[PDB]
């Protein structure tokens with residue numbers, strides 16, 4: 001049927017890492033010292049709160065399972081798990097936070113070269129996920145993290161599902177769903193494919209190009225299916241040439257097979273990234289500028305395991 005999944009799940013001792021401060025609430029910023037390695041790895045530690053919910057523990061281990069099984073520079077790196085009273089996910093620290101907050105916060109300092117490069121990197125990450133027969137089902141600007149302004153990674157595999165040996169599509173049954181990012185076939189028939197992820201990519205690019213605007217702002221989610229069936233789509237962002245907007249629009253075609261492939265999105269955004277001021281028009285683009293003992297600090301990207 002399928003290739004065996006020989007990814008390694010690393011179990012880490014609570015004593016191997018120190019929580020420096022809280023990032024959200026329960027994600028912490030911390031440092032991880034693998035036992036007798038003489039390295040310090042900046043980490044984000046996701047620690048469950050209740051700890052008495054069996055449902056919560058099943059969901060967290062599903063995410064752990066998916067994150068352990070991915071290895072790509074544009075997908076979030078899981079370092080291991082800690083089986084304390086409270087299960088802790090230990091991941092690469094992405095110090096600039098989620099790309100949605102980053103584009104809202106830095107709107108005035110983000111040029112065309114950064115935006116189109118992010119489009120390429122997200123497409124590479126998504127192409128890698130498709131190569132692994134993985135459907136993300138929650139691609140959004142909130143689910144992309146910033147290691148540096150030059151380097152983003154797809155995160156949040158909470159909804160991610162792995163197509164079967166013969167499984168072209170995935171069927172789901174209820175919960176809180178991100179309607180405004182979802183392909184029409186997903187909203188109507190709970191059909192999810194690599195092509196439904198392309199729809200969500202289109203919406204994510206719309207978020208970046210509007211510097212973090214909310215899609216269909218002030219429209220109820222119950223309305224969204226009707227609006228799309230009528231042929232309405234998100235509007236052309238001000239900075240976007242027709243070249244960039246047309247690629248977004250193609251991601252929102254009703255025929256899933258008519259949407260671009262992730263591998264084609266890498267190619268089209270890369271051509272545009274070669275000459276960014278021809279494809280995005282941003283006021284003052286030319287002036288745009290972005291970024292104890294740290295002796296033994298190594299980023300997770302330089303920390304490789306056999």
Ligand SMILES: C=CC(=O)Nc1cccc2c1ncn2C
Nearest residue numbers: 023044091092093094095096097
């Ligand atoms: C100011 C930095 C910040 O908030 N970073 C992060 C937030 C959420 C998840 C994060 C994260 N870094 C890695 N992960 C998985």
